[PDB]
Structures are given as C-alpha cells and as structure tokens.
Design a protein around this nucleic acid. Structure first.
Ligand SMILES: [Mg+2]
Ligand SMILES: [Mg+2]
Ligand SMILES: [Mg+2]
Ligand SMILES: [Mg+2]
Ligand SMILES: [Mg+2]
Ligand SMILES: [Mg+2]
Ligand SMILES: [Mg+2]
Ligand SMILES: [Mg+2]
Ligand SMILES: [Mg+2]
Ligand SMILES: [Mg+2]
Ligand SMILES: [Mg+2]
Ligand SMILES: [Mg+2]
Ligand SMILES: [Mg+2]
Ligand SMILES: [Mg+2]
Ligand SMILES: [Zn+2]
Lengths: 99, 152, 287, 108, 166, 148, 305
RNA sequence: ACUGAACUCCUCACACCCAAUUGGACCAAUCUAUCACCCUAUAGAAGAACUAAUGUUAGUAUAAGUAACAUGAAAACAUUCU
C-alpha cells in the first residue's frame, strides 16, 4: 500500500527538489525562483522545472544565460508598467503568435 | 552498613557460628591440617592462634584450662594442646597457622582453604616459593645491592 | 654499500642453509627423550636436522613453547630453533628455573646482538660503523655491552639523551617485528667468506675456530643481520619486553681506535619489573 | 506484574551477550614447575595438593591403626618414617608412624 | 534428529598439487544429549571460541561451570582424534574455529503449584559442537584506528553523487 | 517493491546503437509437445509463424524440440549471457507471437527497477557546477577579512 | 599478557632490599624539599585585597573536646597535614578559568600501586606519589613553585576555613534513612509496608519526576563544611584543630582552604599570604598556637569572677 | 508573482478505489472419466482454500536462566563432634 501511494509523493518530491535547486541557482544569479519562472514563461521558453534544474547543475553557463534572459524580460515588464501607454514593446517582450 | 564489623555471619546465629568454628578448630587440633571453606578457615585462624597462646599459658592456669575445655570438644586433645602444640611453639610468638587457598570444591565450587599448624608431622604442603635468586631480575637487583654496599 | 653488504651476507647465509639441509636428504628419524622433570618419559620421533626443540615444545603443549627459552640437549644448551642432529635427551630451560644461569646468558647475548644491529643500522650513511665484539660480561654487571668503532669523523661526538632514546625506539621496533633468532653451525671458511669486510669479525671467527676442535662457528641472524655468537640465543626478539640502550662509554686505550661500548639493559616478558625498579636498573646500567 | 509484550530475540541477544554477561578470560593461570599441570597463581596446584592429600590419608590411616580407638590422641610429637629409615636422636621419644613405601622425594 | 556434524569428518579432499598451499586440517567433534542448558553452554562456547586448544583447556580447567568439564573432555577427545586419525602433527597446533551449543531432545515434567495448578518443566538437554583447525589461532581483529576511520569517512564523502538529476 | 527488489541503471549491452544496432537475442529454444492441449498454441505457432519469424530474424537461432511436455516453454538466450525462460502453456498463437516478438526486441539486461529513465556518459558540456562557479574572484585572491 | 605486581618475580633476599631502598629514596626526596626558600623560590608578593591563597590536604585524625575561657565546650576535629606539597601550577590563560590553579598533593603512597603516567610526573617533580591531588583556585599573587611543602601553620588560630571531603559511604540505603521519610506505621494492619516510600508521583503525569527522592546509594560523595573556626595549631605534628565536624571517616583526606563565606572575605591580611615558610625562620613558631578564647592545657582552672 | 490534489491537460493504457447486500468473470489443490506423461488439458464431483472465534491438538518461544528448591562440621570416610 505504501509503495502504491508513494508514486504521488515521488512526483511531488521530485518537483519540490527541482524547485529548490532552481531557487538555489537563481539566487546564485541574483534572481528569485518566481521571477525566473514567470519571466521565462513570458519569454515563451517552455523549459520545465526538471530540465531547468538539470541545466543549473550541469550547464551553469546556459543557466546563467537563462537567468539573464529572465531578468531582461522582468526589467522590460517593469519599464512597460512604469511608462504605461502605447510605448514600443520590449524586444524580448514581443510574443510569437501561432495559428 | 558493616563498617568495622570483623566477624563473619556464619551458621544459624552467633552460637552456631561459635560452634562451627569450634568443630573446625577441634579438627585442626586433632589432625594438624584441615581443608574447609575459605571464609570459615579465615574466621577460625584467629581462634587457633588464641588456643596456641592459651596452651602456652600452661596447664595450671585455670582460665586456660577452661578455655581449652570449651573449645576442644574432644577432651583427649586438651593434653595435646598443652603438651605437644604449646611446647612446639614456645620459641615462636605468633604465626602458628599456615593457611593456603585450594582449588574450589568439586561439589558446589566453594572457595576452600587448607589450614595447618606449622611443624606438623604431615607431608609438607606445595608451598608457593618466590623466584630463585639466580633469575635475571634477581641477579640485576643483587648487582644493585652490591653497588650500593660498595658505595657505602 | 651497506645494503649490498647485507644483501650478499644474507645470500651467503641462505646458500649455507640450503647446503646444510640438502646434506641430509629424506627424513631420518631421531629419538629425543624428555629428561625434564615434568612430562617425563615422552620420546619424540623427530626428523633429523629439521625438527627443533621448538617442535618438541609444540608436540608437548603451547605452554612449553611460550615459557621455554633454551634446550639442554645431552647436557649442552641449544637454541629453541637449532635443528637437532641425533637421538638425545632434551630438557627445556625457562627463565624461572632453579638455576637459570644458561638462559640468562643466552638472553644477555641476544640483547647484545639486538643492540649491535640497532647500532649498525642507526647511524647515517656517511659515517662508517664497525662492530668489533660483544663482551661476555656477567649479568651482575647490570648492563649488556656491545663494542663498536665509529667513523673517525665522530671521534669527539657522544650520543645525547635523544640519540639514546632513538636507539631504544629502534630496539623496540625490532622487538615489535618479533623476528626469530636463526642459527647455524657453519665452518670458519664460510664465516670468513661472509665477514671478509670486517677485520674484527674475521679475528673473532679465528678465535672461535681455535677454541673449538673443528673450524665450526655459531652464526646467528635476527633479520638481514649476520653476526658471530658466543653461544646460544633466545627464540625470538618478542621475548624481550623492556629494552633500553642506557649509555655509551669510550674505552681508555683510545690511541689505536675509539672502542665505544654501548651499554644497555633489558628484561623479558616473563620477568617484567615495575617502573621504579626499572628506573633504578637503568641508573645502574648507565655506568 | 506481568510482561506487557514479548521481548524480541534481538533485545534478548543484546541482554544475554552483553560483555557483563560473558565469561571473563582468566590471565592468572600458570604451569606448576613441580608437575607441569596448570594452576592459578594464588591457588595451590591441584595435582600436587592431591599428592599431598593422598600421602596424608595414608599416614592418617596408619595413625588411626596405631591409636586403636577414639579419644586416644598421643601426648607426644609424631614422626613419619619410611622403609629403610631409622629414628634419629630427635625422633627418639616421638610416636613413629611407619609407612610401607619409599620416602617421597618431595617429602623430606 | 540430525547428525551432520559427525559426518563432516568423513569428507575426503583430492590430493593437493605440489604448488599448492598446505590445507589446514579440520576436525569436527561433538557431544550429544548433555544434561545442561544450551543457553548456559553458549557462554562457555563463546569463551573458548577462537582460542588455541591449550588456552581453551586452561580456561575451562579453572572455570567453575559444570559445562566446563564436559567441554574440556570434548576438546581432549578432539585433540586425540586429530592427532591419531586426521594427521595433525602437533597437539598444541590446533585452535577452536567453531564452538556452539545446540538444543537437545528434552523431556517434559510437571511442577506442582500452590492451588492445584502446575507448570510444565523441561529436563533440558543440549548438544555441543567444536571444529578444531590446525595452525596458530588467527590474530584478533585489531580495532580500527582513527586513520582508517577517517579514511572510511572520506571514502563515503567521495562516493557522493548528484542524486535525482542527469 | 523497490526496496525489496534489486535495481540497476539504464544501459546498453555494448553501446548497441552507436555504431550499429545488434539484435541482443541470439537463441530461442521452443520445447513443444506433439500431444497435449497445453501446447496446442505452441504447435500452431511452430506450424504457421516460427518460419516467418526465423527468416525475419536471421541473427537468432531457433531450436524447436518436440518432446513429451506438460508445460511448453520458450528459452531466450541473449548475447550478454542472460537466459530468460517463459511458459507458453495454454497460450494462443497470437499470445505466443507477441511473447516471441517481445523477447526478440528485448535486451538481455535484467527486468528490474531502473533508477533513472536516462543515462548520459557526458552529462555536462559547460562544466559540472561547483561552489566556485558563479563566484567572482578578488584581487590577489584575498579571502574575506584578510589584511594583506 | 598476564598482570604483574612488583613482588611477583622478586626473591626472598631482594624483597626486603627493594622495600628498604624505595623507602629510603622516598624519605630522601621528602627531606630534599624541606628548604624551599633556598631553592629559587618564586616571587613572594605581599597580601592584597581580593587575593586567594592555596590550601592544604590534611588527614582527619579524630575529634576531641576543647573548652573556651567562658566555660563552653566545643567539639574540635584534628586534621594532620601529612606530606602536603604543591605539585602543579597553571596560569589564568593556561587553565582558561577566571583564576589560576595550584595542584596540591597529600599522603605519600607506594610507587608500586600508581599508574605509569603518575609515576613519571612524580619522578619529574622529584617527590613520591601522593594519595590525593586537589586543585585550589588562586590569584597570580599566590603562585608557589611546585614541590614546595605546606604546613599546618599555613593556617592560624581564629581563622575560618572550609573543609571538603568524601562523606562516609553508607551504600544502597532505603528511603527512610537516605531522605528521612516518615515511613509507615509498624502496626494497625500495615502489610509489608513499614519503610517503603509512599506515592512516588501523581497519576496524571504518568511518570516519575527527575530528581525524585528514591532509595539508592548514600554517602561517598564530596561535601563541604563551611566556616569552621581554627581553634589551635600544633606545629610540631602539623595538626589543625578545626571547629565542629568534618565530612568523611577517620584517617580520610580532607581538602582545607580559607572560608568563602562573605563575612570572612578579607581576613587573610595577617595570615601567611603565599604560605607559611619555616625556612624563613623569622621566629620559630611555638609548639602550639592557641586562639585567644581557648582554655589552654596547663592553664589555671577557670573561675567565673 | 509563485507554491499547491489522485481536479484538469499532457505521452501511453484503461473493467482495475464505497460497509451490509447483490450480479458477473476467473481460479489453487484433491478425486473420477478421458487426455497428458518433468505437471498437463476438457469436463463431472466435493470434507474444495484460514493473519483472527479468551478456537482444538502438537512444537517452540516470552516472562527467564528469572521466582523457587537442596547437603550440620571434620576426617582414616573407621569414626568423632555440634
Ligand atoms: Mg548463611
Ligand atoms: Mg493438592
Ligand atoms: Mg518453559
Ligand atoms: Mg515509625
Ligand atoms: Mg494479606
Ligand atoms: Mg509487618
Ligand atoms: Mg502540482
Ligand atoms: Mg479441473
Ligand atoms: Mg473446509
Ligand atoms: Mg494455519
Ligand atoms: Mg486461532
Ligand atoms: Mg531461558
Ligand atoms: Mg525479572
Ligand atoms: Mg531467590
Ligand atoms: Zn603441581
């Protein structure tokens, strides 16, 4: 019974570990996990938490690039909010449209 | 708490202790060598020495005669106590008894000891002897002693 | 080189051992009867030139092996590891015997031999060390003495307390190694072949060959250390428990060469002395 | 009071194999120089003591035969003489216990 | 009942090649149906376990337990048979490789209690087994030093892997 | 359960796909019976499918032994030395065909828990993370609070 | 392998020789330290407020009466200073405590019954091993060179002192004797309960509070008696007559030091600050020093005028 | 903003989470009829399946090597003594 019930907990703990490791790497790069994840989503990069943790552990330069992209998009969003209006959209803020 | 208590609690009481010691000591006087439980022999050794002293006191001493009459349940041993043992130890002042531990009793594995009057006619016990003076350590200590004597 | 000398000496020793053991092939049976007080009448049917008094003790019991230091074979003292050569009478001698004199002398010689080995292997390479003799001083003297001639470079150097402690540490290292005292009765010719690079050992071998009727000499090895023995030695260095190179004294006739006498004192496991008694023995041995 | 639960074999092994339970090795054993049998250092040798006890039993049986009855303890010293032995001047005036064997070497 | 211990002495090994280490002799002996508790016998077996034959005999000669005499007799018989039949050169060159006590066939009796009630006694019997191996007793396992202990710790540290990742 | 069962890591016998794919299955021994309802499906498989399977998989030697048997069996021997014995007792032709195809497509590695769904011999290309990655270096390598 | 004692391998001739030699060495070592001030003594600073000097290790000889000039009896215990020497000194920094520490050893014992390390330490110090070593907290002003002997005159009459010792061990004692519990009545139905403890706790907590008074070992622990008056000093035999009782049995070693009570904080002005030095020989002390109120033996019978 | 279910989506597969009760599909072993012939098949039967009834019998544990029990002393083992 424990083995059957442990699959849900295995998935939950895997996601928790991935989130913890992503938080560690983002803090190393000066970002917070919510900011990194949300801004990557806004950049339209759909890397999941498992892959993000793998990149953090094994591809530190790629993860630094991703963190830089997330901070770039975060600052673009801040600029848009500050200068709210019809100002030109941020370069990375632009969203590719699929039909 | 038994601080300073010098007498073992033996037998069925004080009287029974005295009687057990008396029987052991009568056997010791008769045979000149008795094997018995270690504690009982240890307790009776002092009484054996005291009987030797009372025998030294002499036949004419009424107190010594009464002590011997009490302690020797077999009256034939009182002449022995006064005419064989005390004359034997007249030169000595103490240490009339030799007590040595014996391998534990086969029945109940009790700590046993053999107690004998020194100078008895019986075969000598396998007494423990100190290491010979000719051993390595003893010879080195003899060298020490000789060096000190030469210095002084 | 000292290493080459040790290697070649050990090689010659091993060749002599092989020749001696091959001289008597097969297994000739010799009867040795225990003439000792305890376990009387036991006759051992041993292999000639292979079996030893230690093998006799192993047949008897472990206590014999642990407590027996020497073996009187037909009335003569023998090393516990010296192979027997004929049917005979054997009696094991321990330290605590009524008259341990022979065992004391054997232990004393063995301690001197260990001191000599430590002396030879302690000094640095640049300094030459030549062991001259192990005087057969009595036990009453309070210290076993080993005579050595050091390099002329050190003609004014006296070992310090730290140097003596290092010598004791080396001796205790040997004791921990627990090496047997291998023995051989080897002809003076082979003895001279082994010790051709030491005039002192050569002349000592000559004296021994003159003393004995034949030219047979007692050659002993602890480990990689060949030496000439005045007599039988103890089974193993582990017999020693307390061992101290007490001091060193230069002999008065210094004009020919500096004969420096290393004086030490030791006691076996069977006769351990308390700390204070040992300290007094050290003080008396330092003389 | 009664046990509330059965104690497991693991707990029982712990308790009964704790070194406090285990038998202690004795290092006071030594070989008797006289006969070579094992003896504890403080205790007398069993073999030698049995020799002495058997000789004492023989001597005491001879003593009883000579006494001839209870309450006949002598008023003089006693000396044991073996075959081929005659009383000495000191032995004169002492009750002689004759043993029909050679004097033991240990006996003197 | 099982009697494999006795049969263990009947195994015959093939002749050893000249360039092969000499196989130490093994002698299996046992005593069956000893009027003694196996629990009590276990302490004696553990005591003499791993020791040389002479040391085991010395300890047993001066131990006060009843089983000590029985084990001493068994060990003496084992030594005698090892010398006579198993080609063991020296009596003293044997050590107790194995020593255990086994439960024997016990008998049930009745113990009368105070109020017409009773308990079931067990007349306990035990077996005793010994394996004697020729050669000096193996040296006791030395306690692990601080150096080896730290080496083990550092090996544990080095064995670490990045768990739950690529 | 995983704790009560051995486990291994995802792996291939000899890097089976790098240079060329090699069918790990090498031997298939079908113990069948002339008589017995248990091996009816095995008999039909031997009649109608075993030849086609043999010519489809030329790298596998198939030994069909028809002997009195109560439980017809198929023994698959793989290149790595693994031997897997399966019972084709009272199995239809389709079931036997699927089992044989699964054995053919399966490697010889033990069917136990696999710790990771992936196995990389070169997990890092940019350098595995260590604490000193993403840590700036200071002038003359001065540790904090160092005076000189 | 087998354990050994110093007499195991010594012959009949060598046993007495070794005894005599070692006793002579011990007494020679003890005498060699009788002149401390003539052997590079450490600086002798004057007494200052807040200074704590070293104490002694005495031996409880017994008790006796002692009457004061007001016709009042006082039970006074005898503490003999038997071979008391300073052994070790550790400074404030070395010991890490608030005060320096002096080790003091007392009642020389056999060298054959001491550990090898202790024997080495005492050999280096030049003194025979002592039965007990106790640590006294002192200020750096009172540091004394190791090996210096201490004497009963280190204290003086009228001083107040603290004495620490192991109490008489009474073994595993019942609750009634150990804690003075009232127990249960002897009669009126009491079944097998006359000296047992009552309820050990309450039902609610379902346990026994730590520190609950229960039957167990009594005595054989270190206890201190504070503020005992020093009625008298016998310099010839090095004896201190300490007011009242002291913990421990007769012939027990008691650690004696100046009282810590606040009332007696700074009364060490006139006492020998580092320690009394007989080698100084400024004025040979009388055989007996008495407190002012003590009815000295040899004095006229007191009359209450 | 993010975290967060077995909710939902995603890749593949799906009869595969309610007590009493009810319907159904299979089935271990045994015997019988035919098969089969290193363990079986199709059927017919039935003393046809036990982690549980202070269940019954037997074995062995736990409590536990615990509670309890026993032999007056010496000796020549004649005998004497308490
Ligand atoms: Mg009693
Ligand atoms: Mg009834
Ligand atoms: Mg039971
Ligand atoms: Mg009351
Ligand atoms: Mg009642
Ligand atoms: Mg009552
Ligand atoms: Mg989730
Ligand atoms: Mg069926
Ligand atoms: Mg049924
Ligand atoms: Mg069942
Ligand atoms: Mg049931
Ligand atoms: Mg039990
Ligand atoms: Mg209990
Ligand atoms: Mg009881
Ligand atoms: Zn003996």
């Amino acid at each position: 019974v424990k083995c059957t019930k442990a699959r849900y907990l295995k998935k939950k703990n895997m996601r928790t570990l991935w989130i913890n490791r992503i938080t560690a790497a983002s803090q190393e790069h000066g970002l917070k996990y919510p900011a990194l994840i949300g801004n990557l989503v806004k950049c339209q990069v759909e890397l999941n938490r498992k892959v993000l943790a793998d990149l953090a552990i094994y591809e530190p330069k790629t993860f630094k690039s991703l963190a830089a992209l997330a901070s770039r998009r975060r600052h673009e969003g801040f600029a848009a909010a500050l200068g709210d209006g019809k100002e030109p959209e941020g370069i990375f803020s632009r969203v590719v449209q699929y039909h | 708490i038994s601080h300073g208590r010098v007498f073992r609690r033996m037998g069925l009481g004080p009287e029974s202790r005295i009687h057990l010691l008396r029987n052991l000591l009568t056997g010791l006087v008769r045979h000149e060598r008795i094997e018995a439980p270690w504690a009982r022999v240890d307790e009776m050794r002092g009484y054996a020495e005291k009987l030797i002293d009372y025998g030294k006191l002499g036949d004419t001493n009424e107190r010594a005669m009464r002590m011997a009459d009490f302690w020797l349940t077999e009256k034939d041993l009182i002449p022995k106590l006064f005419q064989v043992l005390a004359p034997r130890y007249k030169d000595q002042t103490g240490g009339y008894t030799r007590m040595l531990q014996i391998p534990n009793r086969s029945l109940d594995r009790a700590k046993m000891a053999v107690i004998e009057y020194k100078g008895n006619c019986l075969p000598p016990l396998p007494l423990p002897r100190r290491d010979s003076h000719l051993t390595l350590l003893n010879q080195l200590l003899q060298g020490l002693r000789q060096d000190l004597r030469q210095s002084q | 080189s000292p290493t080459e000398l040790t290697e070649m000496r050990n090689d010659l020793f091993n060749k002599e051992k092989a020749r001696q053991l091959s001289l008597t092939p097969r297994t000739e049976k010799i009867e040795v009867k225990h003439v000792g007080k305890t376990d009387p009448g036991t006759v051992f049917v041993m292999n000639k030139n292979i079996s030893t008094p230690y093998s006799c003790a192993m047949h008897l019991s472990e206590w014999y092996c642990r407590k027996s230091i020497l073996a009187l074979v037909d009335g003569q003292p023998w090393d516990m590891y010296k192979p027997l050569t004929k049917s005979c009478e054997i009696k094991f001698l321990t330290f605590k015997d009524c008259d341990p004199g022979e065992v004391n002398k054997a232990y004393w010689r063995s301690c001197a031999m260990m001191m000599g080995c430590v002396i030879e292997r302690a000094f640095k390479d640049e300094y030459m060390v030549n062991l001259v003799r192990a005087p057969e001083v009595p036990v009453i003297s309070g210290a076993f003495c080993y005579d050595v001639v050091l390099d002329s470079k050190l003609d004014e150097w006296m070992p310090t307390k730290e140097n003596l402690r290092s010598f004791t540490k080396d001796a205790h290292a040997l004791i921990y190694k627990d090496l047997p005292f291998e023995t051989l009765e080897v002809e003076a010719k082979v003895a001279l072949e082994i010790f051709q690079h030491s005039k002192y050992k050569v002349d000592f071998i000559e004296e021994k060959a003159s003393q004995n009727p034949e030219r047979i000499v007692k050659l002993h090895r602890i480990g990689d250390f060949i030496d000439v023995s005045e007599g039988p030695l103890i089974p193993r260095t582990s017999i020693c428990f307390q061992y101290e190179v007490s001091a060193v004294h230069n002999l008065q006739p210094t004009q020919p060469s500096l004969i420096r006498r290393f004086q030490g004192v030791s006691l076996p496991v069977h006769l351990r002395a308390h700390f204070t008694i040992w300290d007094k023995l050290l003080e008396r041995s330092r003389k | 009071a009664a046990p509330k639960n059965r104690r497991t074999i693991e707990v029982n092994r712990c308790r009964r194999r704790n070194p406090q339970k285990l038998i202690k090795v004795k290092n006071n054993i030594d070989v008797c120089p006289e006969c070579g049998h094992l003896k504890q250092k403080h205790v007398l040798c069993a073999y030698c003591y049995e020799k002495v006890c058997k000789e004492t039993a023989e001597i005491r049986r001879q003593i009883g035969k000579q006494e001839g009855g209870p309450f006949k303890a002598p008023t003089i010293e006693t000396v044991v003489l073996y075959t081929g032995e005659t009383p000495s001047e000191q032995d004169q005036g002492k009750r002689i216990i004759e043993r029909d064997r050679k004097r033991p070497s240990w006996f003197t | 009942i099982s009697r494999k211990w006795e049969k263990k002495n009947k195994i015959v090994y093939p002749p050893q090649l000249p360039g092969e280490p000499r196989r130490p002799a093994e002698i299996y002996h046992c005593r069956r149906q000893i009027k003694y508790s196996k629990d009590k016998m276990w302490y004696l077996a553990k005591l003499i376990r791993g020791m040389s034959i002479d040391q085991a005999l010395a300890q047993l000669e001066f131990n006060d337990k009843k089983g000590a005499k029985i084990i001493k007799e068994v060990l003496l018989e084992a030594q005698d048979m090892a010398v006579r039949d198993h080609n063991v050169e020296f009596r003293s060159n044997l050590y107790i490789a194995e020593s255990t006590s086994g439960r024997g066939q016990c008998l049930k009796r009745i113990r009368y209690h105070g109020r017409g009630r009773f308990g079931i006694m067990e007349k306990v019997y035990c077996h005793y087994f010994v394996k004697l191996v020729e050669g000096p007793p193996p040296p006791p396992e030395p306690p692990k030093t601080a150096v080896a202990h730290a080496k083990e710790y550092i090996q544990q540290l080095r064995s670490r892997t990045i768990v739950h990742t690529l | 359960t995983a704790r009560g069962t051995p486990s291994r890591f995802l792996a291939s016998v000899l890097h089976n796909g790098l240079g060329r794919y090699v069918q790990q299955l090498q031997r298939l021994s079908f113990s069948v019976s002339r008589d017995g309802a248990s091996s009816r499906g095995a008999r039909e498989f031997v009649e109608r499918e075993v030849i086609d399977f043999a010519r489809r998989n030329p790298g596998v030697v198939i030994y069909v032994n028809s002997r009195p048997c109560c439980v017809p069996r198929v023994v698959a021997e793989y290149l790595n030395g693994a031997v897997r014995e399966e019972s084709i007792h009272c199995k239809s032709v389709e079931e036997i065909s699927t089992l044989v195809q699964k054995l053919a497509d399966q490697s010889g590695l033990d069917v136990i828990r696999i710790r990771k769904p992936f196995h990389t011999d070169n997990p890092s290309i940019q350098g595995q993370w260590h604490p000193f990655t993403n840590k700036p270096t200071t002038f003359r390598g001065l540790r904090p609070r160092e005076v000189q | 392998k087998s354990g050994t004692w110093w007499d195991e391998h010594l012959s009949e001739e060598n046993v007495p020789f070794i005894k005599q030699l070692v006793s002579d060495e011990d007494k020679a070592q003890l005498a060699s330290k009788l002149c401390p001030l003539k052997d590079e003594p450490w600086p002798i600073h004057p007494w200052e407020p807040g200074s704590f000097r070293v104490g002694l290790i005495a031996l409880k000889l017994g008790m006796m009466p002692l009457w004061t000039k007001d016709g009042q009896k006082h039970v006074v215990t005898l503490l003999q200073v038997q071979d008391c020497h300073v052994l070790k000194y550790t400074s404030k920094e070395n010991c890490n405590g608030k005060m320096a520490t002096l080790s003091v050893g007392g009642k020389t014992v056999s060298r054959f019954r001491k550990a090898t390390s202790i024997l080495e330490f005492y050999r280096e110090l030049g003194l025979p091993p002592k039965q007990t070593v106790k640590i006294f907290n002192i200020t750096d002003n009172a540091a004394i060179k190791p090996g210096t002997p201490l004497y009963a005159a280190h204290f003086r009459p009228g001083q107040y002192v603290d004495v620490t010792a192991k109490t008489i061990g009474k073994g595993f004692q019942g609750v009634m004797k150990r804690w003075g519990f009232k127990g249960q009545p002897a009669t009126h139905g009491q079944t097998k309960t006359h000296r047992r403890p009552g309820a050990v706790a309450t039902g609610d907590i379902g346990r026994v509070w730590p520190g609950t008074k229960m039957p167990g070992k009594m005595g054989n622990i270190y206890r201190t008696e504070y503020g005992l008056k020093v009625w008298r000093i016998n310099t010839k035999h090095n004896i201190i007559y300490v007011n009242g009782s002291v913990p421990g049995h007769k012939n027990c070693l008691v650690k004696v030091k100046d009282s810590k009570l606040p009332a007696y904080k700074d009364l060490g002005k006139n006492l020998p600050f580092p320690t009394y030095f007989p080698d100084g020989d400024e004025e040979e002390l009388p055989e007996d020093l008495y407190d002012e109120n003590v009815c000295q033996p040899g004095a006229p019978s007191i009359t209450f005028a």
